Protein backbone atom coordinates (compact mmCIF):
# COMPACT_ATOMS: atom_id res chain seq x y z
CA UNK A 1 0.00 0.00 0.00
CA UNK A 2 1.34 3.40 -1.05
CA UNK A 3 1.89 6.20 1.66
CA UNK A 4 -0.21 9.32 1.44
CA UNK A 5 0.80 13.00 1.82
CA UNK A 6 -1.37 14.65 4.78
CA UNK A 7 -3.26 16.97 5.11
CA UNK A 8 -5.61 16.34 1.71
CA UNK A 9 -6.77 18.48 -0.66
CA UNK A 10 -11.01 18.78 -1.80
CA UNK A 11 -12.00 18.76 -5.51
CA UNK A 12 -14.75 20.76 -5.24
CA UNK A 13 -14.90 23.22 -2.27
CA UNK A 14 -18.67 21.93 -1.39
CA UNK A 15 -17.67 18.25 -0.57
CA UNK A 16 -15.19 16.54 1.77
CA UNK A 17 -11.83 15.67 0.51
CA UNK A 18 -12.32 12.72 -2.13
CA UNK A 19 -8.85 10.95 -0.78
CA UNK A 20 -10.65 9.99 2.71
CA UNK A 21 -13.70 8.19 0.90
CA UNK A 22 -11.35 6.30 -1.16
CA UNK A 23 -9.22 5.04 1.74
CA UNK A 24 -12.43 4.69 4.08
CA UNK A 25 -13.72 2.18 1.13
CA UNK A 26 -10.14 0.13 0.85
CA UNK A 27 -7.63 0.65 3.77
CA UNK A 28 -8.75 0.27 7.16
CA UNK A 29 -5.89 2.34 8.41
CA UNK A 30 -3.88 4.00 5.90
CA UNK A 31 -0.65 4.69 5.96
CA UNK A 32 0.37 8.72 5.50
CA UNK A 33 3.34 11.47 5.67
CA UNK A 34 2.66 14.18 7.97
CA UNK A 35 3.06 17.85 6.99
CA UNK A 36 6.46 17.72 8.86
CA UNK A 37 7.14 14.40 7.15
CA UNK A 38 7.47 12.17 9.72
CA UNK A 39 4.99 9.04 8.96
CA UNK A 40 1.57 8.89 10.63
CA UNK A 41 -1.26 5.95 10.42
CA UNK A 42 -4.94 7.10 9.16
CA UNK A 43 -8.28 5.64 10.39
CA UNK A 44 -11.74 6.61 8.38
CA UNK A 45 -14.03 3.94 9.56
CA UNK A 46 -17.03 5.06 11.24
CA UNK A 47 -16.50 2.14 13.89
CA UNK A 48 -12.71 2.47 13.73
CA UNK A 49 -12.71 6.33 14.13
CA UNK A 50 -14.22 6.35 17.44
CA UNK A 51 -12.41 3.44 18.57
CA UNK A 52 -9.34 5.28 18.28
CA UNK A 53 -10.88 8.73 19.75
CA UNK A 54 -12.09 6.80 23.09
CA UNK A 55 -9.68 3.98 23.57
CA UNK A 56 -7.50 4.92 26.91
CA UNK A 57 -4.29 3.39 24.54
CA UNK A 58 -4.35 6.23 22.68
CA UNK A 59 -2.83 9.30 23.60
CA UNK A 60 -3.90 13.01 22.70
CA UNK A 61 -0.63 14.45 23.76
CA UNK A 62 1.82 15.93 21.39
CA UNK A 63 4.47 16.37 23.05
CA UNK A 64 5.71 12.64 23.94
CA UNK A 65 9.66 12.23 23.47
CA UNK A 66 10.80 10.29 19.73
CA UNK A 67 6.83 10.65 18.65
CA UNK A 68 6.08 11.79 15.16
CA UNK A 69 4.43 14.77 15.11
CA UNK A 70 1.49 16.52 12.87
CA UNK A 71 2.85 20.07 13.14
CA UNK A 72 6.12 21.97 14.59
CA UNK A 73 3.61 24.99 15.23
CA UNK A 74 2.73 24.23 18.49
CA UNK A 75 0.81 25.70 22.09
CA UNK A 76 0.71 24.38 25.42
CA UNK A 77 -2.47 23.25 25.62
CA UNK A 78 -3.05 21.61 29.95
CA UNK A 79 -6.05 20.61 29.18
CA UNK A 80 -4.87 18.05 26.12
CA UNK A 81 -3.55 15.75 27.97
CA UNK A 82 -4.25 12.57 29.43
CA UNK A 83 -5.90 11.49 32.51
CA UNK A 84 -5.82 11.93 35.37
CA UNK A 85 -4.50 15.33 35.01
CA UNK A 86 -7.21 15.82 31.82
CA UNK A 87 -9.91 14.49 34.37
CA UNK A 88 -9.44 17.11 37.15
CA UNK A 89 -9.93 20.02 34.54
CA UNK A 90 -12.37 18.55 33.09
CA UNK A 91 -13.76 18.43 36.42
CA UNK A 92 -13.05 22.02 37.00
CA UNK A 93 -15.08 23.28 33.90
CA UNK A 94 -17.86 20.69 32.80
CA UNK A 95 -20.61 21.81 35.69
CA UNK A 96 -20.77 25.47 33.90
CA UNK A 97 -21.54 23.42 30.20
CA UNK A 98 -24.16 21.56 30.51
CA UNK A 99 -27.23 21.56 28.55
CA UNK A 100 -29.34 23.04 31.60
CA UNK A 101 -26.29 25.18 32.03
CA UNK A 102 -26.07 26.94 29.01
CA UNK A 103 -29.96 26.79 28.13
CA UNK A 104 -29.96 29.30 30.68
CA UNK A 105 -27.41 31.42 28.19
CA UNK A 106 -30.13 31.18 25.00
CA UNK A 107 -32.07 34.78 25.83
CA UNK A 108 -28.79 36.30 25.19
CA UNK A 109 -27.71 34.88 22.47
CA UNK A 110 -31.29 35.50 20.70
CA UNK A 111 -30.66 38.94 21.29
CA UNK A 112 -27.04 38.75 20.14
CA UNK A 113 -27.86 37.15 16.74
CA UNK A 114 -30.98 39.46 16.02
CA UNK A 115 -28.69 42.61 16.29
CA UNK A 116 -26.51 40.73 13.95
CA UNK A 117 -29.48 40.56 11.31
CA UNK A 118 -30.79 44.48 12.37
CA UNK A 119 -27.13 45.20 10.95
CA UNK A 120 -27.29 43.13 7.83
CA UNK A 121 -30.53 44.85 7.15
CA UNK A 122 -29.18 47.66 7.40
CA UNK A 123 -26.70 47.39 5.33
CA UNK A 124 -28.72 45.82 2.30
CA UNK A 125 -28.42 42.71 0.18
CA UNK A 126 -26.09 41.20 -0.96
CA UNK A 127 -23.73 40.42 2.18
CA UNK A 128 -21.52 38.02 3.79
CA UNK A 129 -23.04 35.77 5.94
CA UNK A 130 -19.03 34.96 7.58
CA UNK A 131 -18.65 38.45 7.99
CA UNK A 132 -22.20 39.61 9.01
CA UNK A 133 -22.97 36.10 11.24
CA UNK A 134 -20.77 33.05 11.29
CA UNK A 135 -17.87 35.21 12.50
CA UNK A 136 -19.39 37.85 15.12
CA UNK A 137 -21.96 35.52 16.71
CA UNK A 138 -19.40 32.69 18.52
CA UNK A 139 -16.78 34.95 18.74
CA UNK A 140 -19.26 37.28 20.75
CA UNK A 141 -20.86 34.48 22.53
CA UNK A 142 -17.04 33.18 24.08
CA UNK A 143 -15.82 36.46 24.51
CA UNK A 144 -18.66 37.21 26.63
CA UNK A 145 -18.78 34.25 28.52
CA UNK A 146 -15.13 33.97 29.20
CA UNK A 147 -14.78 37.92 30.22
CA UNK A 148 -12.83 38.94 27.09
CA UNK A 149 -14.00 42.97 26.39
CA UNK A 150 -15.18 43.88 23.77
CA UNK A 151 -12.74 46.24 22.57
CA UNK A 152 -10.15 43.50 22.40
CA UNK A 153 -12.39 41.07 20.30
CA UNK A 154 -11.13 42.20 16.91
CA UNK A 155 -6.94 41.59 17.97
CA UNK A 156 -8.13 38.40 19.20
CA UNK A 157 -9.89 37.49 16.02
CA UNK A 158 -6.54 38.31 14.05
CA UNK A 159 -4.34 36.51 16.79
CA UNK A 160 -6.85 33.10 16.63
CA UNK A 161 -7.30 33.10 12.85
CA UNK A 162 -3.14 33.06 12.80
CA UNK A 163 -3.08 30.03 15.41
CA UNK A 164 -5.58 27.63 13.97
CA UNK A 165 -3.75 28.55 10.38
CA UNK A 166 -1.30 25.74 10.46
CA UNK A 167 -0.21 26.35 6.97
CA UNK A 168 -0.17 29.96 5.32
CA UNK A 169 2.25 31.78 8.64
CA UNK A 170 5.76 31.61 8.89
CA UNK A 171 6.92 30.32 12.51
CA UNK A 172 7.88 34.09 13.56
CA UNK A 173 4.47 35.29 12.61
CA UNK A 174 2.66 32.11 14.36
CA UNK A 175 4.92 32.49 17.31
CA UNK A 176 4.22 35.96 17.38
CA UNK A 177 0.45 35.76 17.63
CA UNK A 178 0.56 32.61 19.91
CA UNK A 179 2.95 34.94 22.63
CA UNK A 180 0.92 37.89 22.12
CA UNK A 181 -2.24 36.20 23.02
CA UNK A 182 -0.96 34.72 26.36
CA UNK A 183 0.13 37.76 26.98
CA UNK A 184 -3.03 39.30 26.94
CA UNK A 185 -4.26 36.55 28.75
CA UNK A 186 -2.02 36.71 31.39
CA UNK A 187 -3.07 40.13 31.39
CA UNK A 188 -6.78 39.65 31.60
CA UNK A 189 -6.04 36.69 34.15
CA UNK A 190 -4.50 39.31 36.46
CA UNK A 191 -7.25 42.10 35.37
CA UNK A 192 -9.69 39.72 36.61
CA UNK A 193 -8.44 39.20 40.31
CA UNK A 194 -7.39 42.68 40.67
CA UNK A 195 -11.34 43.50 39.51
CA UNK A 196 -13.36 40.30 39.09
CA UNK A 197 -16.86 40.05 36.64
CA UNK A 198 -19.65 37.77 36.55
CA UNK A 199 -17.83 35.65 33.65
CA UNK A 200 -16.32 32.26 33.77
CA UNK A 201 -12.60 33.75 34.21
CA UNK A 202 -12.95 35.87 37.41
CA UNK A 203 -14.55 32.30 38.56
CA UNK A 204 -11.33 30.08 37.10
CA UNK A 205 -9.02 32.88 38.87
CA UNK A 206 -10.25 32.83 42.30
CA UNK A 207 -10.74 28.75 42.03
CA UNK A 208 -7.07 29.56 41.60
CA UNK A 209 -6.07 31.61 44.15
CA UNK A 210 -7.13 28.84 46.99
CA UNK A 211 -5.19 26.05 45.31
CA UNK A 212 -1.57 26.12 45.00
CA UNK A 213 -1.55 22.99 42.10
CA UNK A 214 -3.72 25.07 39.88
CA UNK A 215 -1.27 28.16 38.57
CA UNK A 216 -2.40 31.46 37.09
CA UNK A 217 -0.22 29.96 34.26
CA UNK A 218 -2.81 26.62 34.33
CA UNK A 219 -5.76 29.36 33.96
CA UNK A 220 -4.22 31.01 31.32
CA UNK A 221 -3.89 27.86 29.41
CA UNK A 222 -7.76 27.02 29.61
CA UNK A 223 -8.66 30.29 28.78
CA UNK A 224 -6.87 30.15 25.73
CA UNK A 225 -7.86 26.83 25.12
CA UNK A 226 -11.62 27.84 25.17
CA UNK A 227 -11.31 30.58 23.27
CA UNK A 228 -10.08 29.22 19.96
CA UNK A 229 -11.92 25.77 20.10
CA UNK A 230 -14.86 28.16 21.30
CA UNK A 231 -14.68 30.33 18.25
CA UNK A 232 -12.70 28.84 15.23
CA UNK A 233 -15.24 25.87 14.95
CA UNK A 234 -18.45 27.33 15.54
CA UNK A 235 -17.21 30.09 13.16
CA UNK A 236 -16.30 27.88 10.50
CA UNK A 237 -19.81 25.55 11.38
CA UNK A 238 -22.30 27.91 11.40
CA UNK A 239 -21.44 28.98 7.52
CA UNK A 240 -21.25 25.88 6.25
CA UNK A 241 -24.13 24.91 8.15
CA UNK A 242 -25.85 28.23 6.61
CA UNK A 243 -24.53 27.29 3.26
CA UNK A 244 -25.78 23.55 3.28
CA UNK A 245 -29.61 24.27 4.05
CA UNK A 246 -29.31 26.84 1.10
CA UNK A 247 -27.88 23.86 -1.50
CA UNK A 248 -30.72 21.78 -0.35
CA UNK A 249 -33.91 24.34 -0.43
CA UNK A 250 -36.21 21.64 -0.11
CA UNK A 251 -35.04 20.91 3.35
CA UNK A 252 -34.25 24.73 4.01
CA UNK A 253 -38.55 24.87 3.05
CA UNK A 254 -38.99 22.12 5.39
CA UNK A 255 -36.84 23.52 8.36
CA UNK A 256 -38.31 26.74 8.20
CA UNK A 257 -41.95 25.42 8.21
CA UNK A 258 -41.25 23.57 11.06
CA UNK A 259 -38.82 25.01 13.87
CA UNK A 260 -39.49 21.71 15.95
CA UNK A 261 -37.13 20.45 13.24
CA UNK A 262 -34.00 22.97 14.36
CA UNK A 263 -32.49 20.97 17.00
CA UNK A 264 -32.77 17.45 15.03
CA UNK A 265 -31.12 19.45 11.62
CA UNK A 266 -28.00 21.06 13.57
CA UNK A 267 -27.17 16.88 14.29
CA UNK A 268 -27.36 16.30 10.38
CA UNK A 269 -25.97 19.63 9.45
CA UNK A 270 -22.25 18.71 11.25
CA UNK A 271 -22.50 15.18 10.30
CA UNK A 272 -22.86 16.57 6.90
CA UNK A 273 -20.60 19.61 6.97
CA UNK A 274 -17.28 19.35 8.90
CA UNK A 275 -16.03 22.47 10.77
CA UNK A 276 -12.80 21.78 9.11
CA UNK A 277 -10.99 18.93 6.94
CA UNK A 278 -8.31 18.14 9.41
CA UNK A 279 -8.31 14.42 10.64
CA UNK A 280 -7.96 14.32 14.78
CA UNK A 281 -4.65 13.44 15.79
CA UNK A 282 -4.08 10.42 18.00
CA UNK A 283 -0.16 8.44 19.79
CA UNK A 284 -0.30 5.27 20.69
CA UNK A 285 0.86 4.50 24.49
CA UNK A 286 1.73 0.80 23.34
CA UNK A 287 0.90 -1.43 20.64
CA UNK A 288 -2.29 -2.06 19.16
CA UNK A 289 -3.78 -4.06 16.63
CA UNK A 290 -6.53 -3.11 14.19
CA UNK A 291 -7.59 -5.58 11.90
CA UNK A 292 -4.78 -6.27 10.17
CA UNK A 293 -2.95 -4.21 11.02
CA UNK A 294 -0.40 -4.06 13.77
CA UNK A 295 0.04 -0.79 15.04
CA UNK A 296 3.85 -0.03 17.23
CA UNK A 297 3.92 1.87 20.50
CA UNK A 298 4.79 5.08 19.57
CA UNK A 299 2.65 6.08 16.38
CA UNK A 300 0.82 8.53 15.07
CA UNK A 301 -2.93 7.32 14.11
CA UNK A 302 -5.33 9.90 12.58
CA UNK A 303 -8.97 9.78 12.99
CA UNK A 304 -11.04 11.43 9.91
CA UNK A 305 -14.72 12.22 11.54
CA UNK A 306 -14.82 13.73 7.98
CA UNK A 307 -14.61 10.54 6.30
CA UNK A 308 -16.76 8.69 9.26
CA UNK A 309 -19.42 11.11 9.39
CA UNK A 310 -20.03 9.65 5.52
CA UNK A 311 -19.10 6.22 6.67
CA UNK A 312 -22.47 4.22 4.57
CA UNK A 313 -21.61 1.28 7.11
CA UNK A 314 -23.16 3.89 9.83
CA UNK A 315 -25.39 6.51 7.72
CA UNK A 316 -27.62 6.01 4.97
CA UNK A 317 -27.64 8.10 1.64
CA UNK A 318 -24.55 9.62 3.87
CA UNK A 319 -24.19 12.62 0.63
CA UNK A 320 -27.92 13.14 1.36
CA UNK A 321 -29.67 15.37 3.70
CA UNK A 322 -32.31 14.02 6.04
CA UNK A 323 -32.87 16.98 9.11
CA UNK A 324 -34.45 14.22 11.56
CA UNK A 325 -32.30 11.60 10.42
CA UNK A 326 -32.86 8.56 13.72
CA UNK A 327 -29.74 7.43 15.35
CA UNK A 328 -27.64 10.45 14.35
CA UNK A 329 -24.23 9.75 16.60
CA UNK A 330 -22.20 11.24 14.37
CA UNK A 331 -18.23 12.23 15.13
CA UNK A 332 -18.01 15.97 14.77
CA UNK A 333 -17.88 16.51 18.37
CA UNK A 334 -15.53 13.70 19.36
CA UNK A 335 -15.83 10.75 21.51
CA UNK A 336 -14.39 9.16 24.65
CA UNK A 337 -13.50 11.43 27.44
CA UNK A 338 -12.41 14.43 25.67
CA UNK A 339 -15.94 14.69 23.75
CA UNK A 340 -16.21 18.49 23.13
CA UNK A 341 -16.80 20.48 26.37
CA UNK A 342 -19.12 23.03 24.30
CA UNK A 343 -21.46 20.33 22.74
CA UNK A 344 -24.08 22.00 23.76
CA UNK A 345 -23.37 25.58 24.03
CA UNK A 346 -22.28 24.69 19.93
CA UNK A 347 -25.57 23.26 19.53
CA UNK A 348 -27.42 26.15 20.97
CA UNK A 349 -25.69 28.48 18.94
CA UNK A 350 -26.54 27.22 15.86
CA UNK A 351 -29.94 26.49 16.19
CA UNK A 352 -30.59 30.25 17.79
CA UNK A 353 -28.28 31.64 14.64
CA UNK A 354 -30.05 29.45 12.11
CA UNK A 355 -33.42 29.95 13.51
CA UNK A 356 -33.25 33.25 13.33
CA UNK A 357 -31.36 33.65 10.27
CA UNK A 358 -34.69 31.55 8.59
CA UNK A 359 -37.33 33.75 10.67
CA UNK A 360 -35.37 37.08 9.34
CA UNK A 361 -35.41 36.48 5.56
CA UNK A 362 -38.32 33.81 4.26
CA UNK A 363 -36.57 33.80 0.23
CA UNK A 364 -33.01 34.05 1.37
CA UNK A 365 -30.96 32.55 -1.09
CA UNK A 366 -27.33 32.55 -2.36
CA UNK A 367 -26.50 35.30 -4.38
CA UNK A 368 -24.07 33.84 -6.46
CA UNK A 369 -23.51 30.42 -7.91
CA UNK A 370 -21.80 27.35 -5.89
CA UNK A 371 -19.15 27.21 -8.61
CA UNK A 372 -18.24 30.65 -7.68
CA UNK A 373 -16.89 29.23 -3.94
CA UNK A 374 -13.79 28.95 -2.15
CA UNK A 375 -12.54 26.53 0.32
CA UNK A 376 -10.28 29.05 2.61
CA UNK A 377 -7.90 27.08 4.18
CA UNK A 378 -6.62 23.58 2.54
CA UNK A 379 -3.59 22.99 4.49
CA UNK A 380 -5.35 23.62 8.27
CA UNK A 381 -7.15 21.44 10.38
CA UNK A 382 -9.56 23.70 10.41
CA UNK A 383 -11.69 25.98 7.44
CA UNK A 384 -14.50 27.32 6.16
CA UNK A 385 -15.00 29.41 2.92
CA UNK A 386 -13.93 32.34 1.68
CA UNK A 387 -17.69 34.04 1.50
CA UNK A 388 -20.97 33.04 1.11
CA UNK A 389 -23.02 36.22 0.03
CA UNK A 390 -26.39 35.92 0.02
CA UNK A 391 -29.73 37.86 -0.78
CA UNK A 392 -33.20 38.23 0.28
C1 LIG B 1 -18.79 27.34 21.87
C2 LIG B 1 -18.36 26.30 21.18
C3 LIG B 1 -17.24 25.35 21.64
C4 LIG B 1 -16.49 25.28 22.76
C5 LIG B 1 -16.51 26.19 24.03
C6 LIG B 1 -15.60 24.15 22.60
C7 LIG B 1 -14.66 23.71 23.51
C8 LIG B 1 -13.94 22.53 23.44
C9 LIG B 1 -12.90 22.11 24.35
C10 LIG B 1 -12.39 22.92 25.57
C11 LIG B 1 -12.46 20.90 23.95
C12 LIG B 1 -11.37 20.05 24.63
C13 LIG B 1 -12.14 19.06 25.50
C14 LIG B 1 -11.23 18.10 26.24
O1 LIG B 1 -10.09 17.85 25.79
O2 LIG B 1 -11.67 17.57 27.30
C15 LIG B 1 -13.21 20.51 22.78
C16 LIG B 1 -13.07 19.33 22.08
C17 LIG B 1 -13.58 19.06 20.82
N1 LIG B 1 -14.39 19.92 20.08
FE1 LIG B 1 -15.26 21.71 20.83
N2 LIG B 1 -15.86 23.56 21.38
C18 LIG B 1 -16.84 24.28 20.75
C19 LIG B 1 -17.39 24.05 19.50
C20 LIG B 1 -17.09 23.01 18.67
C21 LIG B 1 -17.59 22.80 17.33
C22 LIG B 1 -18.57 23.77 16.60
C23 LIG B 1 -17.04 21.65 16.88
C24 LIG B 1 -17.21 20.92 15.52
C25 LIG B 1 -18.10 21.26 14.57
C26 LIG B 1 -16.21 21.11 17.93
C27 LIG B 1 -15.50 19.94 17.86
C28 LIG B 1 -14.73 19.37 18.85
C29 LIG B 1 -14.12 18.07 18.74
C30 LIG B 1 -14.23 17.11 17.53
C31 LIG B 1 -13.36 17.86 20.04
C32 LIG B 1 -12.53 16.62 20.43
C33 LIG B 1 -11.07 16.81 20.05
C34 LIG B 1 -10.39 15.47 20.12
O3 LIG B 1 -11.10 14.47 20.39
O4 LIG B 1 -9.16 15.40 19.90
N3 LIG B 1 -16.26 21.96 19.01
N4 LIG B 1 -14.10 21.52 22.49
Excluded at 229 to 246: H, K, W
Excluded at 280 to 301: C, K, M, Q, W, Y
Aim: hydrophobic share 40%; aromatic share 6%; charged share 25%.
Amino acid sequence: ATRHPYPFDRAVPTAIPPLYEELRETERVAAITMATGDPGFLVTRYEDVRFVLSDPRFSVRQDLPGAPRLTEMTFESVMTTDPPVHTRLRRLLSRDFTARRIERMRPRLEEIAEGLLDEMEKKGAPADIVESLAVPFPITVICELLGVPMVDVARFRGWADTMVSLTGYSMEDWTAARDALESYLDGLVAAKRENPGSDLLSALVATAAEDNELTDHDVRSLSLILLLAGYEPASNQLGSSVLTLLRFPDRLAELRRDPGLLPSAVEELMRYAPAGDGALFRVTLEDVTIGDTHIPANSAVLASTQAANWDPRRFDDPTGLRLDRPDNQHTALGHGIHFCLGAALARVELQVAIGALLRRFPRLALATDESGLRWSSPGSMLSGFAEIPVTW
